[PDB]
């Protein structure tokens, strides 16, 4: 642990500064250091961890897609493939790092529904990113690992959270994207998005104005996908 000499609270403070400075690799390293202190993460701290790694892997995924597209056009010297492979290996390394933090030991210590669902959704997301670049022998096993994590998160969220809970909504959104983009199950994606949207709409009447805004924001993303898929 390169962050081992820094106080937990200082790592969290610096992760917030790094977000403001748009230094997402720094953010991720600070939050990794905070996780490695061994204490559970608060709601805000979980969000910082997720935002940091989502930005890091988001940049890698965008670059991988650019290079993969150039490579595929060239297959219609070794440099394009070599550089795509380098970016791919870097991306896989970040996903493995996130999955390692979840496995050592965030998930096993997460007893509340909000934390456990949050971490299992992350686990599904990072296996999904591995699946986007996977080809042979373990592509099926990677896909099943994403599916299994999302499914456990879904089972807990349906029993323990209201249908408008933003984490429950984002989990359903991302699982529907998994179905559409990874599992070649567009009908399952559409059905999940529709049922999620409808059950959320029926629960909006229970919410404060601020919660209503939080939930409808994510509901619009579900509707956006349904518009694209139908």
């Amino acid at each position: 642990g390169a962050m081992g000499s820094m106080e937990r609270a200082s790592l969290i403070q610096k992760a917030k500064l790094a977000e403001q400075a748009e230094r997402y690799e720094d953010m991720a390293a600070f939050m990794k250091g905070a996780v490695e202190k061994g204490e559970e993460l608060s709601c805000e701290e979980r969000n910082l961890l997720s935002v940091a790694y989502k930005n890091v892997v988001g940049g890698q995924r965008a670059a991988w897609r650019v290079l993969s597209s150039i490579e595929q056009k060239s297959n219609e010297g070794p440099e394009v493939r070599e550089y795509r492979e380098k970016v791919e290996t870097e991306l896989q390394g970040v996903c493995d790092t996130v999955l390692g933090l979840l496995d050592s030991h965030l998930i096993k210590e997460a007893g509340d529904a909000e934390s456990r669902v949050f971490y299992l959704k992350m686990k599904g997301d990072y296996y999904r990113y591995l699946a986007e670049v996977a080809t042979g022998d373990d592509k099926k096993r990677i896909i099943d690992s994403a599916r299994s994590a999302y499914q456990e998160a879904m089972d807990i969220s349906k029993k323990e959270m209201p249908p408008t809970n933003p984490i429950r909504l984002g989990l359903a959104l991302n699982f529907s994207v998994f179905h559409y983009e990874i599992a070649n199950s567009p009908e399952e994606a559409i059905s999940l998005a529709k049922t999620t949207f409808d059950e959320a709409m029926a629960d909006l009447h229970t919410l404060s104005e601020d919660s209503y805004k939080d939930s409808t924001l994510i509901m619009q993303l579900l509707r956006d996908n349904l518009t694209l898929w139908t």
């Binding site: 917030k16 977000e19 805000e44 969000n47 910082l48 997720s50 935002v51 989502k54 930005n55 988001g58 997301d125 984002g170 959104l173 991302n174 994207v177 559409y180 983009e181 994510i218 993303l221 956006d224 996908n225 694209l228 898929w229």
Partner: peptide, 9 residues
């Protein structure tokens, strides 16, 4: 098809 953006705390 968009997942949660999730890029801003």
């Amino acid at each position: 098809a968009g997942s949660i953006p999730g890029r801003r705390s």
